[PDB]
Symmetry: D2
Subunit: 97 residues, 4 copies
């Protein structure tokens, strides 16, 4: 399952409300350097013929089809306070080794 934490959902709902117009979020993964992978997290106004759309806690999360299996299991979290305020990704099968 791709999911949002409660805080991530409440934050995201308040940006989508306050921005008025929209479909939802893209979740994505891209290359970063020669040995890294980086989560991609942005607003999208429509799904592409290449996406699958998931929905959790009322937000639509658009995910490219060729990355669906990779991204399965990720949870988007939001840390509301402190020096690491912001969005965060986790996945129980990717260990902090």
């Amino acid at each position: 399952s791709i999911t949002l934490s409660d805080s991530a959902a409440a934050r995201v709902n308040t940006f989508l409300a306050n921005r008025g117009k929209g479909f939802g979020l893209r979740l994505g993964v891209r290359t970063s350097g020669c040995s890294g992978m980086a989560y991609v997290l942005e607003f999208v106004d429509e799904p592409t013929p290449e996406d699958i759309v998931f929905e959790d806690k009322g937000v639509k999360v658009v995910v490219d089809g060729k990355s669906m299996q990779f991204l399965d299991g990720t949870q988007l979290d939001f840390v509301k306070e402190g020096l690491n305020e912001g969005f965060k990704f986790t996945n129980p099968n990717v260990k902090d080794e």
Copy 2:
């Protein structure tokens, strides 16, 4: 499955001779901060029962079963020359840029 290019296979077949010790390569993933992930590439002596072992051009590639969702269809590759000399990963689950 997992594969290796002719150049990566040739380099790793060499490293294997020169250390005459192990079973093959492990290919893994780990966390890299809260917004990404890094490849793990190492020599392993023995597989575990949690692993799925592929063999391509004489190199056994060992992958923990729970990491397959991140890695599957990946080609391990190698650039002989230039400033990016080294191993690199060509991963269909991951988008370029």
Copy 3:
């Protein structure tokens, strides 16, 4: 020197109250694999004699003297809203892209 924007200062002045414990922020650098570096941003209770302490809008910023070459002229910044919500660093020594 080191500075903070009005938004980052306001957020950090809050975090400071709410924990009523420390002296200010430490800004540092560390290694991030063999091809890069990461910012360190934390609360410190006491400076050391190795540090250079700046103060901007009521927040003491503590920097190890040997890290100044990486950090100097840096502004600590903060984005209240959107998917990049969080602290960010605006560092004149470092090029954008």
Copy 4:
């Protein structure tokens, strides 16, 4: 000092010979994500009005002026064999914390 290790110099000299034409390397540092910095390492055919040119072990290393202080102290190394073959950067004031 900005320096090249012996191996990095011999490797680099053999690419600049074999490529025939050139001035030297750029060393650079760029942003990477919201909390990362990435070394930039490429060939350049000329210095820009913005660069300072350094020379060590016979190779010209071109460095943007606004990044000179940041980059002071870095050594470019080259690992000739093993799974981490390739170029590498170090700096005694950036600890592997």
